[PDB]
Design an enzyme around this catalytic site. Structure first.
Site, PDB file in Angstrom:
ATOM      1  N   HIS A   1      -5.093   4.809   8.660  1.00  0.00           N
ATOM      2  CA  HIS A   1      -6.691   4.111   8.334  1.00  0.00           C
ATOM      3  C   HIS A   1      -6.531   2.560   8.307  1.00  0.00           C
ATOM      4  O   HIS A   1      -5.352   2.169   8.252  1.00  0.00           O
ATOM      5  CB  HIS A   1      -7.206   4.623   6.942  1.00  0.00           C
ATOM      6  CG  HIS A   1      -7.285   6.157   6.944  1.00  0.00           C
ATOM      7  ND1 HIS A   1      -6.149   7.069   6.822  1.00  0.00           N
ATOM      8  CD2 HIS A   1      -8.382   6.861   6.836  1.00  0.00           C
ATOM      9  CE1 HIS A   1      -6.708   8.304   6.724  1.00  0.00           C
ATOM     10  NE2 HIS A   1      -8.098   8.345   6.984  1.00  0.00           N
TER      11      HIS A   1
ATOM     12  N   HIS B   1      -2.795  11.210  15.043  1.00  0.00           N
ATOM     13  CA  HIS B   1      -3.391  10.457  13.739  1.00  0.00           C
ATOM     14  C   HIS B   1      -2.360   9.673  13.544  1.00  0.00           C
ATOM     15  O   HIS B   1      -1.158   9.805  13.433  1.00  0.00           O
ATOM     16  CB  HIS B   1      -3.733  11.543  12.993  1.00  0.00           C
ATOM     17  CG  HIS B   1      -3.782  11.151  11.541  1.00  0.00           C
ATOM     18  ND1 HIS B   1      -5.113  10.526  11.132  1.00  0.00           N
ATOM     19  CD2 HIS B   1      -2.976  11.076  10.285  1.00  0.00           C
ATOM     20  CE1 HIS B   1      -4.881  10.080   9.964  1.00  0.00           C
ATOM     21  NE2 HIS B   1      -3.634  10.195   9.400  1.00  0.00           N
TER      22      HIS B   1
ATOM     23  N   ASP C   1      -9.296  -5.387   3.868  1.00  0.00           N
ATOM     24  CA  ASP C   1      -9.063  -6.197   2.750  1.00  0.00           C
ATOM     25  C   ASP C   1      -7.425  -6.755   3.130  1.00  0.00           C
ATOM     26  O   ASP C   1      -6.432  -6.867   2.705  1.00  0.00           O
ATOM     27  CB  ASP C   1      -8.751  -5.508   1.718  1.00  0.00           C
ATOM     28  CG  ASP C   1      -7.880  -4.241   1.707  1.00  0.00           C
ATOM     29  OD1 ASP C   1      -7.425  -4.027   2.921  1.00  0.00           O
ATOM     30  OD2 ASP C   1      -7.598  -3.427   0.772  1.00  0.00           O
TER      31      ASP C   1
ATOM     32  N   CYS D   1      -3.063   0.642   7.981  1.00  0.00           N
ATOM     33  CA  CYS D   1      -2.184   1.413   6.880  1.00  0.00           C
ATOM     34  C   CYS D   1      -1.821   2.541   7.848  1.00  0.00           C
ATOM     35  O   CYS D   1      -2.539   3.653   8.086  1.00  0.00           O
ATOM     36  CB  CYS D   1      -2.763   1.822   5.725  1.00  0.00           C
ATOM     37  SG  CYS D   1      -1.676   2.418   4.287  1.00  0.00           S
TER      38      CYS D   1
ATOM     39  N   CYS E   1       0.941  -1.283   0.117  1.00  0.00           N
ATOM     40  CA  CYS E   1      -0.049   0.051  -0.130  1.00  0.00           C
ATOM     41  C   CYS E   1       0.841   1.296   0.134  1.00  0.00           C
ATOM     42  O   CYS E   1       0.159   2.465  -0.456  1.00  0.00           O
ATOM     43  CB  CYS E   1      -1.016   0.149   1.390  1.00  0.00           C
ATOM     44  SG  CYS E   1      -0.173  -0.008   2.933  1.00  0.00           S
TER      45      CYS E   1
HETATM   46  C1  LIG Z   1      -2.466   7.645   3.689  1.00  0.00           C
HETATM   47 AS1  LIG Z   1      -3.237   6.192   4.997  1.00  0.00          AS
HETATM   48  C2  LIG Z   1      -1.574   5.382   5.434  1.00  0.00           C
HETATM   49  O1  LIG Z   1      -3.924   7.379   6.265  1.00  0.00           O
HETATM   50  O2  LIG Z   1      -4.393   5.029   3.942  1.00  0.00           O
END
Ligand SMILES: C[As](C)(=O)[O-]
EC number: 1.8.4.11
Length: 144
Positions: free
Chosen positions: A103, A100, A107, A118, A63
């Site tokens: 996300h 933060h 999957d 991620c 990713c």
């Molecule tokens: C750019 As992301 C690591 O918050 O899916």
């Protein structure tokens, strides 16, 4: 594990680390060293030191950012609806410092829970196994 004042953060965190953890910015895909790092140890909140992910659950999702199948402890992170920039995703933030992180998507490796976390390498700090005891995380060696 606590979070310093916004003012104190501005003088300890790099511009990148601050923008990502405090303003939910996103590092360039494939730009962070942690993306391809697969050594035994844990990843902690760059702001508070709170343990967030284990090397045991890190994998290559392609990713562009460090990817894990799960947090080191279900309570370590919080989930939030993210309707930012025309779409619906689930944001992941740290529990103690509310940084933060990134996300999570549905999957990931099916036999590992099916989730893909991620995470921005800029929101983390790696602690190699060989240093966990000295760093104060000896009790977590069982998680690697
Ligand atoms: C750019 As992301 C690591 O918050 O899916």
């Amino acid at each position: 594990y606590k979070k310093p004042s916004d003012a104190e953060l501005k003088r300890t965190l790099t511009e990148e680390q601050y923008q990502v953890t405090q303003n939910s910015a996103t590092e360039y895909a494939f730009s962070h060293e942690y993306d391809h790092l697969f050594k035994p140890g844990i990843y902690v909140d760059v702001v508070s030191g709170e343990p967030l992910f284990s090397s045991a659950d890190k994998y290559d999702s392609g990713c562009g950012w460090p990817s894990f199948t799960r947090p080191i402890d279900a309570k370590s992170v919080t989930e939030h609806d993210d309707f930012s920039f025309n779409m619906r995703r689930t944001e992941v933030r740290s529990r103690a410092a509310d940084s933060h992180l990134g996300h999570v998507f549905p999957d990931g490796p099916r036999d590992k829970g099916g989730l893909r976390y991620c995470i921005n390498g800029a929101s983390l700090k790696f602690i190699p196994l060989e240093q966990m005891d000295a760093a104060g995380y000896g009790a977590l060696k069982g998680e690697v």
